[PDB]
Design a protein around this nucleic acid. Structure first.
Ligand SMILES: Nc1ncnc2c1ncn2[C@@H]1O[C@H](COP(=O)(O)OP(=O)(O)O)[C@@H](O)[C@H]1O
Ligand SMILES: Nc1ncnc2c1ncn2[C@@H]1O[C@H](COP(=O)(O)OP(=O)(O)O)[C@@H](O)[C@H]1O
Ligand SMILES: Nc1ncnc2c1ncn2[C@@H]1O[C@H](COP(=O)(O)OP(=O)(O)O)[C@@H](O)[C@H]1O
Ligand SMILES: Nc1ncnc2c1ncn2[C@@H]1O[C@H](COP(=O)(O)OP(=O)(O)O)[C@@H](O)[C@H]1O
Ligand SMILES: [Zn+2]
Ligand SMILES: [Zn+2]
Ligand SMILES: [Zn+2]
Ligand SMILES: [Zn+2]
Lengths: 783, 783
DNA sequence: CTGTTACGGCTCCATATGGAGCCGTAACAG
DNA sequence: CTGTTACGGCTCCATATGGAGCCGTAACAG
C-alpha cells in the first residue's frame, strides 16, 4: 500500500526516493520551479498512463512499484466542438433524456431527445443550435476597393500575385462571367459578385491555366470563396482565423434549442427539456426536489431522480452554483473546467485510480474552501488517492501526508527537504513552508496607504453579461484590487470591457468591445499592458536573455573587445539567428533531425557544434576567459557578479534577479519555460523599461502556482512598480495580496444572475466594516 | 466491494441483474452464443474503458456502480511494426540495456544499446535488422512478355489502359529514353529497364499529358516503379500486397543484429547482447542465475538482476519455455501473444484494475494448466479482479464465483441461470454446466474404432523450423488427431507443410511451401478444404442463408408460386443485390447514411423500406401467408417445421440445425457473426455438399470458445462427416476430442529446439502404454 | 434433377504555398 | 547615450481510380 519510487532523475531532481502512502490525502508543496510539478506530472502520471496505455515517453526513473492508472486534472481547455456542452460533459444530459423518455407526457423514446443523433436533432441547424456561417461584410470589409487592390482579404483567396492559384481562379471566373478584375467591386453587377462568392453550384465552367513554362486549359467547377472557406472550416490558428470571419447567430427555426418540434413538445410539469436545461443549477435542483408525481411515476423514476439529485448536489457543492446546463463548453475558463471535471469524476464512481490534481482551489473565493475540501475528502473516501499540488494555508491543515521539496529552486532545489504530517513539518527548522506555517516570517500589513491623486477612471453603462447597469470608479496612481465571489462578473468587467476598450483607444487593437456605454479619463492613460500566463515564444530561437534585451548589450560588449576588432567581426555576428556566426551544420537550431524508416523524426544534439549552437571561429573569441556559449550557459546569479563592472547590463540583470529568476540560465529555450517563469520574465521586461507615469497594467490571477514566499516577492515587486508612477489593477483572491492593497472594489453579493452590482468600495478598513460582504468579513478576521 | 450492474439489455440479454464480487476469481460460463461474451466485453469492459477515457460507444445499461478501469486480453494480433519484438513487448529489453550499460565491460551508456534510437541503431539497416526491399524477379516475373502485354503486374503501375496515369508515365519515360513500349522487355537494353525501375534519381525530365479534352505538357521527375512501391509501403490488404513482392533478408553488415559495432563489442561473461537475446528463455534464465560477479558489481546490479530473474521466472511459469527474445512480434499466434501479454501484465505490477480475459488456456496442453492457474491466481492476489471466460473442467475447480448463463442460446438464452460456488452450481438441477460437472451426461468413449484401408499419406524430409528430419504417415479414411506439447512443431508441420503442399498440388494455390523433401500419395486426395475462424464475409450482403445456398432454392420456390407467375417476375427478382426488386431508396443495403457538420456518418434504418430491404411490390407477393422479409427474418428452428414439405430445402435446413445453429436467423448480417458461428456455417456448407470419398479437411483448434455440450455436438458432427468417406485431421488439445479419435500422432518430447521428433503413433490404447508421453499418461488417466 | 465451370455485376478498402510571430538592423528623436 | 519606429530575414503551422471478394446467372455434364 505504498507507491514507492526509487531513482527519480527527471529534469532537475537529485535522485530522490519518496514513499507516498496509498488511499490518503497527499499534498506536494514547493517554491516555483523547485520540482514539485516535475515529480508528479513528468514521473508518476506519465508512468501510470504509459503502463495503462501499453496494456490496452518513458520517464527517467529506475522502477516504481504499486502504481495504478492515473488521471490528470489540469487548468487546460480547447475549443473542442459545439456539440459538447456543460450538460454533456457533466454526464447529466443522458439521465435527463432517460427521465424525459420514461416519465414525459405528450403535449416516447430516448433516441429523439438528443441533438447528437438524427432522430431528434433539428434538420435546419443540424443539431448545433447556432448557424455559424460567414458574414458577407466580414468577407469583403472594403467594398469600395477593387479586386486588384485586394478586396478579398480571406486566406487562400488573395489575388495579389498573378502567379498564385487564386489569381488564376479569379481570371477564369472573370472569363466565364465576362467581367473585369480592375473594375470596382461596387461598380460590378451584384449577380457576378454573388456568383463569385457562392460559387457555380457545380456548374461546368472553362478554366485557363498559365504558368512559367506550361500552358493549357481544363474543365472544372468553381466552388466559390465563401463555400471553400466554409468547407475548410468544416474539415478543420486556423480555427481562430475561420471564427474571425464567422458571426454566431441562433437558429431561426429552433431558436437555439437545437431540437425538433416533436421533442420540444413533450414537457414535464409545464416545462420542456430546454426550460430545465437553460436555468441555474441551484434553481434546477430546487425545481427537481419539489417535483411531484404519482406513485407509479415515482416508482419508475426513482432510479433516475436519485442520480440527478446526487449529481446536482455534487456540482453545487463543488462551487459552481451559477452555471447553465445549456452553456457551450468552449467558453469556459481553466478553473471552471477543472472544477467541472472534478465534479464529474466525483459523481462517476470510478474506484482505484491515482488522481493527480493541479491546484484545485484556483479562481475560487476563500468562502468556498470549506466545501471544496469536503468534496475532495469525499472523492478520496470513494476509494482513491490524491496528489493535490496546493499552496493555500487552508489546504495543508486538512491533509494527511505533506511532501515538501526544495530547499531552493532550479539547480539548488530538487531534493526532498522534509516529509510527515502538518505538525512535523511545522516544527521542522529547515523547511521554508513549515517556517511560514509556524509564523516565523509573515507578510506584514502596510501602515500607511497611498491616496488617489484626483484622477479617476469612469465606467458608464456597464451591462455586459450579468452586470446590473453599474458604474464604477477606479483610482489612478494607487494599487487597485478587484475582488468578488465566483461568477460575480469581475473577470468579465475587467477583460471584456476595460482592457478591450483601452486597447482599442490606445494600441489601436481590433477586438470586440464589451457592453459599455462610455468611459471617461481615457486620455490620462498613455499605454496599457496585459500580463498573462502564455509562453513568451514558441520557436526555439527565444530565450529569457533575448526577450529582456540584455543580449544585444552583451553582443555589443563582445564585439567591443580587442580580439573582435582585430578579426573585424560585427556587433550582431555573435547571434544564433543570422548567417555567418552560427553553426551552419544545424542552421543555428542546435538540434539535428534524423528520420527512420518507420519512426518519427528523432532530435539529437548536433555533432559538428556539440550543442553549443555556434561555430568554432565564433567560440575562438574569449572575453575574460569566457566564450559566447559559456555566457549563454551561465545562470543569472553568476551573471550578477560577473558583469558588475558594466552598469548597462547590471541594471537589467539586477532587475531580473529581483523578480525572482535567480535559478534559470540565459540560454534556456522558451519552449521549456512554464507559466510562472513567463510571467516573471514579462514582469522583469516591464520593470526594465523607463517609467512614463501613465502606464496601466492588468494582472489576471497573478498568484497562480506561486508559493507564499513567491507571493511575498510578487507583492514587493508590484508595490515597487506602483511606486514608479504607474497604476496596476489586479484580480486577486488570496488574502495575502488583498490585505496589502490600497483600493479595493468588491462585486457581489452573490454569483450569477443574483449578483452583478457593486457592494463595497474604498480602503480595506472601510470594506471590513460592511456586514454584507464576505471579503470584508475575511479581511476583518485577518486584520 | 461489489460490481453491481442493473438493467443490462445489450444484444440479446433479458434485463439481467448480477452482483460480481470484487478482488476474487470470477468465471463466466455458457453455451456458444448464450451471451457470456456480450455481458463481459460489450457491457463491462466497454463501460470501464469509456469511463477512463472520458476522464483523461456507450453500452445499453442503466447504471453500473463500483467499476474500475479495465484491460481486455484477447487472442488478436496485427503486423504492428518490425521494431517491436518479444523482448520489447515483454519489457525486458530495457532492463537488459540498463544491465549492459551499468555492468558491461569494453572489449557505457544505455542510449547506444537500443535499436530504437540513432545512438546505437545500425546505419545500414536503420535498426530494423532485415533489409526488406523489392525483389526484381517479383516485380517482373515474366521478363519474356512485353510492356504492352502487362509485364509490370504491380498495383499502381499497370499500363493495360492507355488512358491511365501509369500508361502516361510509361509513355513519357519511353519518350525521354527513346524506347518503344511494344518492344520485348528482354530485348530492351538493361540500362533503360534499370532507369525505369529505379527512377531518374531526381533528374529533370519532360512529360507529355494527353486526355479526352485536355492537352499539354509539364516538367517533373520519374520516381520509378520500385521506388514508388517502396515509398508507398513505407507510408502505409495493402500491407500483404506490399509484402508479397518483398523478400526478407538479413542485413549484410550487422548480420541481423540491428546494432552498431561498438554496441556489439561490449560483452558480459563472453556473450554480447545478441547472444543473450537470441537464446531460449529457460537457457537465458539458467545463464543469468549462474552468472558470477564481484561484490561491487553485485551491489550495483542487484536491482536489475532481481527484476530480470523475476520477469523470466514469470514468463517461463506462464508456459512459454521455448521462445526467443529476438523473435519478431509480428509472427506470433493468438495464444502465444495472449500469454505474453498476461505475463507482461503480471510482471508490470499494475494494481486496482479489472482484468477481462478471453479463455486464457487456449492452445495449451493439459500438463501446463497446473501452472497457468497458479500464474492467474498470483495475478489475482496482486490486487486485481478477473473475469476469466473459461470452459475447461480444470478451471472451474480453482475458482471462487461462477456465473452461468443460458439456459439455451440466441433468443432462448440470455438470462442468468445459476450463480454461486462450484458445489452449488454442481448440485443445481437446472444448469447444463452443473449437469456436465456432476457427470450426469458425459462423452462416452467409443468401443470399436476404424482401421486404415491401406492408403496412407507419406511425409519425407520434414525439416521446417525445429523439425528434426522426421517422416510421418497419416492414415486415410480414419479420424486423425495430432497432439503435442506447446511449441513441438505440430502447427508448423500441418499448416506450413501439408496444407500448403496439398493446396499447391490440387487447388493450384500460390503459397510458399515448407521445408519438405517429398510427399507420397497426393493423387489419392481429390480436394482439400481448410476451416478457420475467419468471418464468412465482410460486406453486409452475406447471410448464413446465402452462403449455404438455400437462398437460391427458396427464391425459386417463391418464383414458382401462382402470384409470381401471374405478375411475370423472375427467379432472382426476390434478391437484395439486384436492380428491380430491392428497395431503391437504400440500394438494397438496408441502412441509410446521414452526415452531420462535425460528426461522422450515422447509420439509421431506411424510412422508405422500414428496414425490410425490399420494395412494397416485392413484399406484396405472399407464400403461405409469409413474405420474403418474413422468411428472411425467421429462425432456423421455425424454418425446419415450415419447409417440411419440400425436401430440397429440408435437407440443408436439417443439416444446419444438426450443426447446432438453431438459434440464429437466416437474415443475420455476416458482420455480426462471430468465429464459432462462422465455423459452424462452414461445417454446414461442407456437410451439405455431396461426398466424393476423397476429401481432406483440416481443422486448427476447432474447440476454441465452445462449451462441453458444443464439444460433444462437434465430435458427433465430425464423426458423421468421417463416416461419409472423407478423412479429417484435427489439431486438438482437449482430452474429450482426443479420447474419441481413431489415430493419434504425438510430437514431442518437449517444446522448442529440444523436441521436434515423433514419440508415439497409433491407436490411443497403444499411446497410453508409452511412459515417455504426457498425452499417453493423460489418456491412461482418463480411460 | 444436381453438381460443376465460367462469366458479369456489385460493394468495400487502399493509395507545395501562404500567413503568423519573433529577432536583428537602420534611421530618427530627446 | 537611450528610447522609439519602421523594415528585412528567418522558422513554424495550416490546408479520384484501381483491386479484392462475393452474389447472381448462363452453359454443360452425369
Ligand atoms: C525548468 O523545469 C524545471 C521544473 O520546473 P517546475 O518545478 O515544473 O516549475 P513549476 O513548479 O513552476 O511548474 C525547472 O528546474 C526549470 O528549470
Ligand atoms: N459566453 C457567455 N454566454 C453567456 N453568459 C456568459 C458567457 N460568459 C460569461 N457569462 C456569464 O458572465 C459571468 C462572468 O463571471 P466571471 O467574471 O467569469 O466570474 P469570475 O470572475 O469568478 O470568473 C458568469 O456568471 C456567466 O454566467
Ligand atoms: C449474435 O450476438 C449475440 C451474442 O453472441 P455471443 O454470446 O457473443 O457469442 P459467443 O459467446 O460465441 O461469442 C448472439 O445472440 C448472436 O445472435
Ligand atoms: N517465423 C519464425 N521464425 C523462426 N522460428 C519459428 C517461426 N515460426 C515458428 N517458429 C518455430 O517453430 C516452432 C513451431 O511451434 P508451433 O507448433 O507453432 O507451437 P504450438 O505447438 O504451440 O502451435 C516453434 O517452436 C518456433 O520456435
Ligand atoms: Zn434549427
Ligand atoms: Zn551544428
Ligand atoms: Zn545493418
Ligand atoms: Zn430503402
Amino acid at each position: 500500500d505504498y507507491i514507492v519510487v526509487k531513482g527519480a532523475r527527471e529534469h532537475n531532481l537529485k535522485n530522490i526516493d519518496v514513499k507516498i502512502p496509498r488511499d490518503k490525502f497527499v499534498v506536494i508543496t514547493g517554491l516555483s520551479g523547485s520540482g514539485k510539478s516535475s515529480l508528479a506530472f513528468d514521473t508518476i502520471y506519465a508512468e501510470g498512463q504509459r503502463r495503462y496505455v501499453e496494456s490496452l515517453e518513458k520517464p527517467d526513473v529506475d522502477y516504481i512499484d504499486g502504481l495504478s492508472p492515473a488521471i490528470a486534472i489540469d487548468q487546460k481547455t480547447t475549443s473542442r466542438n459545439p456539440r459538447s456542452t456543460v450538460g454533456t460533459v457533466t454526464e447529466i444530459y443522458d439521465y435527463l433524456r432517460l427521465l424525459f423518455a420514461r416519465i414525459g407526457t405528450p403535449h416516447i423514446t430516448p433516441r429523439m431527445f438528443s441533438f447528437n443523433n438524427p432522430y431528434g436533432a433539428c434538420p435546419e441547424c443540424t443539431g448545433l443550435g447556432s448557424l455559424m456561417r460567414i458574414d458577407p461584410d466580414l468577407v469583403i470589409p472594403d467594398k469600395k476597393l477593387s479586386l486588384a487592390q485586394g478586396a478579398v482579404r480571406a486566406s487562400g483567396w488573395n489575388i495579389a500575385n498573378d502567379e498564385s492559384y487564386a489569381r488564376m481562379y479569379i481570371d477564369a471566373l472573370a472569363k466565364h462571367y465576362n467581367f473585369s478584375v480592375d473594375t470596382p467591386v461596387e461598380e460590378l453587377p451584384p449577380h457576378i459578385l454573388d456568383i463569385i462568392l457562392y460559387g457555380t453550384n457545380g456548374e461546368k465552367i472553362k478554366i485557363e491555366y498559365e504558368r512559367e513554362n506550361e500552358k493549357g486549359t481544363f474543365m472544372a467547377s468553381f466552388p466559390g470563396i465563401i463555400n471553400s472557406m466554409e468547407r475548410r472550416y468544416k474539415e478543420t490558428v486556423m480555427k481562430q482565423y475561420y471564427e474571425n470571419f464567422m458571426s454566431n447567430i441562433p437558429c431561426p427555426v429552433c431558436k437555439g434549442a437545437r431540437l425538433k418540434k416533436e421533442s420540444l413538445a413533450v414537457t414535464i410539469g409545464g416545462k420542456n427539456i430546454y426550460e430545465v436545461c437553460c436555468l441555474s443549477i441551484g434553481e434546477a435542483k430546487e425545481f427537481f426536489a419539489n417535483l411531484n408525481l404519482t406513485e407509479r411515476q415515482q416508482l419508475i423514476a426513482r432510479q433516475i431522480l436519485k442520480e440527478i439529485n446526487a449529481r446536482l448536489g455534487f456540482l453545487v457543492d463543488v462551487g459552481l452554483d451559477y452555471l447553465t446546463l445549456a452553456r457551450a463548453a468552449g467558453t469556459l475558463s481553466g478553473g471552471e473546467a477543472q472544477r467541472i471535471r472534478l465534479a464529474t469524476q466525483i459523481g462517476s464512481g470510478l474506484m482505484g485510480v491515482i488522481y493527480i490534481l493541479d491546484e484545485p482551489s484556483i479562481g475560487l473565493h476563500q468562502r468556498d474552501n470549506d466545501r471544496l475540501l469536503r468534496s475532495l475528502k469525499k472523492l478520496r473516501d470513494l476509494g482513491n488517492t490524491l496528489l493535490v499540488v496546493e499552496h493555500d494555508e487552508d489546504t495543508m491543515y486538512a491533509s494527511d501526508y505533506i511532501i515538501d521539496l526544495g530547499p531552493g529552486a532550479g539547480s539548488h532545489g530538487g531534493q526532498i527537504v522534509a516529509e510527515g504530517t502538518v505538525e512535523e513539518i511545522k516544527q521542522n527548522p529547515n523547511s521554508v513552508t513549515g517556517e511560514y506555517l509556524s509564523g516565523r516570517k509573515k507578510i506584514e500589513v502596510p501602515k500607511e496607504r497611498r491616496k488617489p491623486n484626483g484622477k479617476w477612471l469612469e465606467i458608464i453603462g456597464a451591462r455586459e453579461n450579468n452586470l446590473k447597469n453599474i458604474n464604477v470608479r477606479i483610482p489612478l496612481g494607487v494599487f487597485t484590487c478587484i475582488t468578488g465571489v465566483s461568477g460575480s462578473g469581475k473577470s468579465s468587467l475587467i477583460n471584456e470591457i476595460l482592457y478591450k476598450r483601452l486597447a482599442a483607444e490606445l494600441n489601436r487593437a481590433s477586438v470586440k468591445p464589451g457592453e459599455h456605454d462610455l468611459i471617461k479619463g481615457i486620455e490620462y492613460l498613455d499605454k496599457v499592458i496585459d500580463i498573462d500566463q502564455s509562453p513568451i515564444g514558441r520557436t526555439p530561437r527565444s530565450n529569457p536573455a533575448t526577450y529582456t534585451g540584455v543580449f544585444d548589450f552583451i553582443r555589443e560588449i563582445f564585439a567591443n573587445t580587442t580580439e573582435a576588432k582585430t578579426r573585424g567581426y560585427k556587433a550582431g555576428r555573435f547571434s544564433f539567428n543570422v548567417k555567418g556566426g552560427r553553426c551552419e551544420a544545424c542552421a543555428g537550431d542546435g538540434i539535428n533531425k534524423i528520420e527512420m524508416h518507420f519512426l518519427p523524426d528523432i532530435y539529437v544534439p548536433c555533432e559538428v557544434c556539440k550543442g553549443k549552437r555556434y561555430n568554432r571561429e565564433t567560440l575562438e573569441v574569449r572575453y575574460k576567459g569566457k566564450n559566447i556559449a559559456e555566457v549563454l550557459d551561465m545562470t543569472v546569479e553568476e551573471a550578477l557578479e560577473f558583469f558588475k563592472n558594466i552598469p548597462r547590463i547590471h541594471k537589467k540583470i539586477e532587475t531580473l534577479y529581483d523578480v525572482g529568476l535567480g535559478y534559470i540560465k540565459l540560454g534556456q529555450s522558451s519552449t521549456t519555460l512554464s507559466g510562472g517563469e513567463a510571467q516573471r520574465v514579462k514582469l522583469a521586461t516591464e520593470l526594465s523599461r523607463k517609467s512614463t507615469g501613465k502606464t496601466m497594467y492588468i494582472l489576471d490571477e497573478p498568484t497562480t502556482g506561486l508559493h507564499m514566499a513567491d507571493v511575498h516577492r510578487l507583492v514587493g515587486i508590484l508595490h515597487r512598480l506602483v511606486e514608479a508612477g504607474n497604476s496596476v489593477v489586479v484580480i486577486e483572491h488570496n488574502l495575502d495580496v488583498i490585505k496589502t492593497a490600497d483600493y479595493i472594489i468588491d462585486l457581489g453579493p452573490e454569483g450569477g444572475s443574483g449578483g452583478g452590482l457593486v457592494v463595497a468600495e474604498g480602503t480595506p478598513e472601510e470594506v471590513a466594516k460592511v456586514e454584507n460582504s464576505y471579503t470584508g468579513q475575511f479581511l476583518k478576521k485577518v486584520l
